């Protein structure tokens, strides 16, 4: 059960840890989060009380190192940092736990929500989408643009999601224009799965990561990417049956976890109506169609 200790909390901030969050007051004796489940990626995130425009956070895996948060009063944010001195780190965490200055990752034993949202997400794939090779953890915020968004202005701070474009030469074989546009199976299976992702696990990981960045940071480009990857599967006549089964599970837990009050900006009417009611796979997403109908009937 790993720990992300905090040096201090000098500014009032809502702190997120995966799907949980708590309010910390300015200079409240807060020294971090303990009992973080090993085996999954995690995201710690921040919304300042004073400026709810500072919405940002760190993807990390506690198996990859000893990570702590320290407020930087120059750049005005909570920064993730790695402590290479294992013994100094254990010593600091032991003190903070003894003084009960750490909130406990509040996982209900029966609850598989985080596993279900992060099933395919791996830190090594996150770090290729978010390039800052000197760190083992990945910074994301609400304003970061995608490589695709920037093609339509600082490459270093971009989300390197796989470019998907239904009206591109990549997507359309010469002499197969109507066939490839109306049935995206060649684009899904040959170009993206076999060609770029290598397998459905990497495809799903990127899709899941795109959703989480959309949900936790309101990252618009991430939301575009999540919908594009759903739409590419739904608009393909030929999808492996296990991919359809697994997609139904992934989307079910995403829709379950989405805050009710964000469905208006985080869900694209056109894509969902097309995927659930018009597409090749309109009858392949039972779990997803039932939760969407019962939770967001107005959208459809």
């Amino acid at each position: 059960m790993n720990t992300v200790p905090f040096t201090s909390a000098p500014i009032e901030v809502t702190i997120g840890i995966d799907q949980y969050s708590f309010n910390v007051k300015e200079n409240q004796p807060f020294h971090g989060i303990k009992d973080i489940p090993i085996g999954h990626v995690h995201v710690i995130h921040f919304q300042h009380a004073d400026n709810s425009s500072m919405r940002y956070g760190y993807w990390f895996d506690c198996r990859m190192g000893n990570f702590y948060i320290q407020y930087d009063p120059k750049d005005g944010l909570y920064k993730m940092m790695e402590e290479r001195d294992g013994a100094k780190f254990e010593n600091i965490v032991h003190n903070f736990k003894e003084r009960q200055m750490m909130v406990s990752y509040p996982k209900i034993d029966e609850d598989d929500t985080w596993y279900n949202l992060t099933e395919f997400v791996q830190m090594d794939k996150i770090r290729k989408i978010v390039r800052k090779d000197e760190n083992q953890f990945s910074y994301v915020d609400s304003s970061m643009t995608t490589v695709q968004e920037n093609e339509l202005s600082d490459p270093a701070h971009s989300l390197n999601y796989t470019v998907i474009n239904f009206k591109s030469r990549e997507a359309i074989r010469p002499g197969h224009e109507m066939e490839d546009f109306l049935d995206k199976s060649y684009y899904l299976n040959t170009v993206m799965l076999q060609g770029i992702f290598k397998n459905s696990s990497n495809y799903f990981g990127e899709l899941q990561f795109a959703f989480l960045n959309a949900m936790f940071f309101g990252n618009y480009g991430s939301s575009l990417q999540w919908h594009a990857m759903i739409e590419l599967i739904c608009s393909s006549a030929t999808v492996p049956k296990h991919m359809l089964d697994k997609l139904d599970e992934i989307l079910y837990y995403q829709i379950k976890t989405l805050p009710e009050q964000y469905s208006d900006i985080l869900l694209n009417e056109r894509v969902w109506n097309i995927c659930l009611y018009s597409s090749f796979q309109k009858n392949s997403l039972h779990n997803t169609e039932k939760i969407m109908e019962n939770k967001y009937p107005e959208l459809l």
Binding site: K167, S168, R169, I172, E177, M178, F181, L182
Partner: protein, 237 residues
């Protein structure tokens, strides 16, 4: 973006552009079967591809063989239209390729964009204008070449005949749109107006009667009157 009343002069500038109309590509007669069901029988169609500046019409005849054994023909027709337009652009020397293609129907945008991915500099545009190009099959010599075709065929016409010798492309296009609007609204009346006075002939290499400037004013007047009357009957105004 969209071609409309505002940006209307752009049609007659020196940027090569083509209008594409797909309304006569897929044409059927609906009939009863022996068992009292309904079936369609396709007849020959055409893509109407027009340079509004020069009057050059690239009439690609769509022979009924194109549809043999195919499903969702109204959807295929749009893609077939896009394939033929893209084949036509590729067949033209670079300096003759259009800089813009304006589709009369918005359903043609995606099929044409996808077929023209090799031509990122050619802008594919819709129009807000309600152009009467569907009445192209009311022009006898165009109808005749379409119905007689026994195979796929491209036929080249100048839809302005020799008008550009005497008038601008703006005036030639307004005359064309007035003739086609009339033919579309009341084909019988419009054809009566054009082919009553027997002394006036259609030259072998032309589509429309050889009218003096004064006879064109009279004809144009009769076309407007035809269009306004039918508007009265339509809306009981």
């Amino acid at each position: 973006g969209a071609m409309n009343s505002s940006n209307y002069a752009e049609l007659f500038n020196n940027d090569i552009k083509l209008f594409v109309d797909d309304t006569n590509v897929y044409r059927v007669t609906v009939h009863k079967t022996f068992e009292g069901n309904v079936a369609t029988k396709a007849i020959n169609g055409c893509i109407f591809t027009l340079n509004p500046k020069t009057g050059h019409l690239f009439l690609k005849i769509i022979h009924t063989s194109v549809w043999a054994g195919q499903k969702r023909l109204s959807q295929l027709a749009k893609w077939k239209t896009a394939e033929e337009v893209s084949a036509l652009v590729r067949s033209l020397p670079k300096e003759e390729q259009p800089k813009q293609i304006i589709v009369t129907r918005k359903a043609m945008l995606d099929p044409l964009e996808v077929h023209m991915l090799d031509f990122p500099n050619i802008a594919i545009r819709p129009t807000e204008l309600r152009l009467p190009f569907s009445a192209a099959m009311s022009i006898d010599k165009l109808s005749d070449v379409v119905m007689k075709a026994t195979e796929p065929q491209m036929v080249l016409f100048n839809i302005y005949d020799d008008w550009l010798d005497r008038i601008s492309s703006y005036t030639a296009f307004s005359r064309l749109t007035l003739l086609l609007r009339a033919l579309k609204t009341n084909e019988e009346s419009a054809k009566m107006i054009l082919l009553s006075d027997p002394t006036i002939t259609i030259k072998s290499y032309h589509l429309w009667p050889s009218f003096t400037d004064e006879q064109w004013i009279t004809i144009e007047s009769q076309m407007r009157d035809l269009i306004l009357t039918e508007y009265g009957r339509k809306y009981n105004v």
